[PDB]
Design a binder for these strands. Structure first.
Ligand SMILES: [Ca+2]
Ligand SMILES: [Ca+2]
Ligand SMILES: [Ca+2]
Ligand SMILES: [Ca+2]
Ligand SMILES: [Ca+2]
Lengths: 93, 93
DNA sequence: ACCGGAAGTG
DNA sequence: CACTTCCGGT
DNA sequence: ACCGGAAGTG
DNA sequence: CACTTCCGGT
């Protein structure tokens, strides 16, 4: 199906075998990408789009700021925080 | 039908019209039930289980503590906090 | 009010 | 399993 | 590395 | 419609 980036990141985060590239860290919702290039590769793989990289992936995350789906952890790089306010709304059709 | 309780609460919390009975409040994840009995009634209405009350509903939420799907905001009553660790795993098939 | 054990449901 | 039902704890 | 405007895609 | 692509800012 037509999977979302916020759904894809939760998929990777749920399994601890992906700890090399992405992992939960800090308060509730906060996670960091320990290998942003690896995460961006797998997102391009799922979408059938091998031109994907972290610079293009991060602008995809940026649109979630206005949607209230997630936000940046200011200071700790490659680290973002999911926000239930928008996730809950995005979960419904 | 075929729905989880954690999914049902996020469904209600997405629509702000439901602020009479339940609403987001506090840090990321934290919500409270301003009319706990009204929430329990709609859960019984959804599940087709007419004897549902808060006492029965609260024990369903206590099973989520060991699952890491949510936790209790200690002190503030009728107030619980979703936890992304369990919500991530629970969303997958 | 909130907690978790115990037994039961399809 | 994911609750529902019930109850003796704090 | 992170920010958001802009134009384009399936 | 949710990104994808590109880029001139900080
Ligand atoms: Ca049992
Ligand atoms: Ca009692
Ligand atoms: Ca006891
Ligand atoms: Ca600009
Ligand atoms: Ca540049």
């Amino acid at each position: 199906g037509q999977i979302q980036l916020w759904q894809f990141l939760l998929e990777l985060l749920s399994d601890s075998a992906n700890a090399s590239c992405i992992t939960w860290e800090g308060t509730n919702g906060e996670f960091k990408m320990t290998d942003p290039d690896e995460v961006a590769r797998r997102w391009g793989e799922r979408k059938s789009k091998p031109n994907m990289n972290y610079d293009k992936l991060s602008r995809a995350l940026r649109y979630y700021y206005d949607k209230n789906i997630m936000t940046k952890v200011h200071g700790k790089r490659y680290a973002y925080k999911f926000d239930f306010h928008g996730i809950a709304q995005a979960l419904q059709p």
